[PDB]
Every structure is written in structure tokens, then in C-alpha cells.
Amino acid sequence: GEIQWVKPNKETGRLNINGPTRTKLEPSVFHDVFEGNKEPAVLHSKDPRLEVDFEQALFSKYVGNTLYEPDEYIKEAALHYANQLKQLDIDTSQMSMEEACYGTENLEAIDLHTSAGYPYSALGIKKRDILDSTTRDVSKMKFYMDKYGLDLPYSTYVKDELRSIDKIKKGKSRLIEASSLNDSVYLRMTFGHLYETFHANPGTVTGSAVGCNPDTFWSKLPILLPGSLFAFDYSGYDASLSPVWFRALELVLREIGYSEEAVSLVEGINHTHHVYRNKTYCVLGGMPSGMSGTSIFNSMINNIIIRALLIKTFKGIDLDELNMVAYGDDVLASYPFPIDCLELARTGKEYGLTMTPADKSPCFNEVNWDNATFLKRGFLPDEQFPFLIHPTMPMKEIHESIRWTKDARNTQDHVRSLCLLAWHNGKQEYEKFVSAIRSVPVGKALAIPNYENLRRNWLELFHH
RNA sequence: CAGGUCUC
RNA sequence: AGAGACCU
Ligand SMILES: [Zn+2]
């Protein structure tokens, strides 16, 4: 992805978009009970912690574009994935607007507690002034769709969240691209049924883990991904995507039966306009974060990428022997013979992708079940039932989360959620966690899950 | 002050 | 009808 131009909002006729600049994060009652290094992200050009220019760091993720049109490998890769998806009989028919706005069994309703985006936000028009869960009306939405159209610019905001101490200094806070309500509705009308299919089928047919529940999905993964594992990290995956990958997505969508009207929306994702503050800018390539379908489309593109890297890097690859799941840019894959990602990453550089070792070393070392991570979680066989696999969120991440809060009124839920993640690291680690929690007065006032109850509830998901 | 998934 | 966890 690459910024094509920047213009003042006076020249483009767009309204200003500034957004909050003070974090909602505050040190919690546990801030000094646990060690951690993260702090609230830089949200302002004049944050005293900065050590470089903010805006430059902010937009550095747009590293440029390499290829614009698919080569032989990307074409083969897209067609192999599209063929695989065919066995799901995805309904390519337009979803009803009533269902696109208000949801189905497998598609959550549009979030009514968030902004409606351009231009509604600057006009003080909330989503609840157009949509109504009880009434399930679409007359008002249809009116505002035809009034304001589609391809409305995204509103850029800096994401208020914890960041490591290095990304505080380097200004590397994350951006979110607030979609317009209109575009969300139209994207959900067009691809709603694909979203349903994907949400209902996390695994190696979709090649996607969106919709997985790790408590039970982890036990399936060693069976879905037999053989030798390989994985790696992307730096700034979304923003690094060249236009070739959206062309490749078009190939996938057409081959599974999408009408030319449906497939023509991908260029609206490849080529987007954004309002940050008092300026409008154009982005060519790069997936917008904050668009309907971001997770799923990023995961679909990744399935194309892994396939194409393999058949371009190595001779004699059989794509039918690849196994993989992707959650956006996060990937865990298997193949009958070991795969050298040092070579995958060189090929990836040609495609404009920056890939680094999974263990965060400078060297690409073997990935196996004892060091693989996915959605930041490790894989740990149960001690009693070794076919049942614990997802292990590192205690270090749990410590970072517990040290801060955005609303201390919900401390008990926050801690309970972390306990639900933490017990998977075993009885000694869990008891040490609860006992540290209990070493301060708020901690003694909390209902904390008992470890034996946690383990028993988890076993009951499997009936064993 | 976005799009999602998961869980209480 | 709420909350928290997690991914972009
Ligand atoms: Zn443009």
C-alpha cells in the first residue's frame, strides 16, 4: 500500500476529522503488583515520550507497492484456493438489506454502539437514528444510501491501546479507518453469505480461523495441520499489500461464482480515500482496517500468498498437501516436508511482503508444536489427556493487560477474563497469579474462579 | 473514537 | 440487555 497524494480538506471538500487525544487507559490497582513494560499509545503529535516525528511514524506503514498484476504463480495460487472453497457451496446471492443490517444466525448485526462514519458523524447522525433492532426497518437506511452513495472516505483515528515501550518512542501507534455506514451495509449485502460460511467453518477448508474458539479449536489443530509446521510474522501486513493481491482476490471471487457487480467492489478496497484531521489522502493497495470483512479478506489473501510463495520459491511443491489456517495476517501452516521460511521470506520481499522469524529471533528456526503460537497462544498437551491441547496465553501478556483499565467499575470481569486465559498455563502458575491478585485490597474483594472448576468446565466441553 | 471473532 | 478477552 502506498499513499498517492495528500490534499487539504479545503481542496477536496471533505469535513475535518480530529477525534480524541487523551487516553482512557489508567493505571489499575494491580499496576505495581505485576511487572510490565507497555503504556498507553501515543495519541498526540506533542506527546513528551516521542522520540521521532509522530505523523511520519504513523504513515510509515505504507511502504509502497511492488506488483500490480498477478504473475503465473499468483494465478495458480488463487485458482487452487478458489477450487478448495468450492466444496463450501458459498451462496453468492446478494443478502437482504434487512439481514445485512440486523444480522443472521451466523452474521452479527451491525454494531449500533459505534460511529456511522462519514458524513453522518460530522452531522451528528448516529446509527440509531436510522436503524432499529426492535423495528428492523430499512426504509430510512435505503434513503440515506441513495442520498450519500458509496465509496465514502474512511475517517482515520489513532487507536487508544497499550503499546510496548519501544513503539511509544518510535511513534508506532496504530491507525483505524472508520468506514462509512453506507459502505458497511453494501459490503455486507454483497458478501454477507460468504461471511456466514466462514464464521461457521473455521479450519483448513476455509483456511481461516475467524470464528474459532481456542479452548476447543486448539485440540483440532494438530489433526488439521499434520506433518512439519511452518510459520512466520509479517511486519505491517495490511498496509504492505500491493494491488496484485486484490487482483488475486478478484480471481478467487469470480471463480466461486460471484457476479461482476460483486467482484467490482474489490477495487473500492484497493483504492481508498481517507480523512485524517484536516487533510484528505489517497491509498493505493493496503487493506483498510475498519471495513466490513477486513479479517476475512485479509485471511483469504493470506491463503493466496502462502500458496504463491511456495510454488515460486521451491520446485516440486504439491499445493494439495498444504494445510493452513489464517486469522488475518497470523498464519499457522503444515506440509509433509519441512519448509524453509528464509527462502519464503526472500520470495516475499519480491512481492512487497516483509516476513520475519516466528520466534522473533533474527534467524528462521524450526517451528514445532512446542514453540508454535497462534493468536498469541502456545500449544500445551494436557497432562492427563494428551489429545486435549491447552491454548497457552503467556503470563507476560496477562500481566500487561491487568496493570491498566479503561473503567475500574468492571475490574471483576477484567480479572475473571484473564483468569480464564491464565489457568491453561497450569496449577502452579495460576495459583501464583491469583495470590498476587489477592495481595492488594481490591483483589480480596473479587470473585476469582477456582482452578479445579476451570479445568472441569474445560474438560466438559469435550465430555471427557 | 472503525471492522470482527471468542467467552462470562 | 450489559461486560470483559482477543485479532486487524
Ligand atoms: Zn484516489
Author numbering: 1 to 464
Sentences from the paper on this structure:
Building on the previously established methods in assembling enterovirus RdRP EC and in capturing various EC states, we used an EV71 RdRP bearing a C291M mutation in such approaches, since the equivalent PV RdRP mutant (C290M) was shown to produce higher quality EC crystals. Building on our recent work reporting an enterovirus 71 (EV71) RdRP EC with an intermediate conformation of its template-product duplex, here we report three types of translocation intermediate crystal structures that define multiple nucleic acid conformations bridging the pre- and post-translocation states, both in the regulate forward translocation and in an unusual reverse translocation induced by pyrophosphate (PPi) and divalent metal ions. These structural data, in combination with enzymology characterization of the RdRP, highlight the key role of RdRP motif G in controlling the critical movement of the template RNA strand that is probably the rate-limiting step for both forward and reverse translocations. A striking common feature for both modes of translocation is that the template backbone, in particular for positions −2 to +1, stayed fixed relative to its starting point of translocation. As we pointed out previously, this phenomenon is probably related to two motif G residues (T114-S115 in EV71 RdRP, “G” symbol in Figs. 2d and 3d) that create a hurdle-like steric blockage right at the +1/+2 junction of the template backbone.
While the template strand density of this type of structure appeared normal, the density of the product strand clearly indicated the presence of two sets of backbone phosphates. By modeling two alternate conformations of the product strand, this unusual density can be readily interpreted. Accordingly to the six-state nomenclature of the RdRP NAC suggested in our previous work with S6 representing translocation intermediates, we assign these two EC states as S6A and S6B.
